[PDB]
Amino acid sequence: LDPNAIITAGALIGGGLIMGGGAIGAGIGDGIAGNALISGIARQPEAQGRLFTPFFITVGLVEAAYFINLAFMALFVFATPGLQ
Amino acid sequence: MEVEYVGEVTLYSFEPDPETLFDALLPRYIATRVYAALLEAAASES
């Protein structure tokens, strides 16, 4: 039972959890923001121009987190902290 | 009151909902028509 094997399995599981959480959060948050945008445009077709400015912000604040998660997942699998 | 439809012309938002507003407004319309008729009658009487 090589220590590196256990550490790598744990790192893979941790990265899986990180990406699962990131994907759930990103998908649902983007869906909710898009729901807001779609309803706003449906009510006021010409408001779309001014609805992208907040929408994008929201998307940022969502995707940022997701992408942050991504970075750390790459840290777990490749530069596995604590691996000997 | 009967309804006659005109072919065609951002939609409106109604609080709380269109049904209650319509129910509360239609009697006001009847009163408005009665008042307009009364004013017309006064002018024609003069």
Curated annotation (Swiss-Prot), chain B:
Signal peptide: none annotated. It is found in: Cell membrane. Produces ATP from ADP in the presence of a proton gradient across the membrane. The gamma chain is believed to be important in regulating ATPase activity and the flow of protons through the CF(0) complex. F-type ATPases have 2 components, CF(1) - the catalytic core - and CF(0) - the membrane proton channel. CF(1) has five subunits: alpha(3), beta(3), gamma(1), delta(1), epsilon(1). CF(0) has three main subunits: a, b and c. Belongs to the ATPase gamma chain family. This is ATP synthase gamma chain. It comes from Mycolicibacterium smegmatis (strain ATCC 700084 / mc(2)155) (Mycobacterium smegmatis).
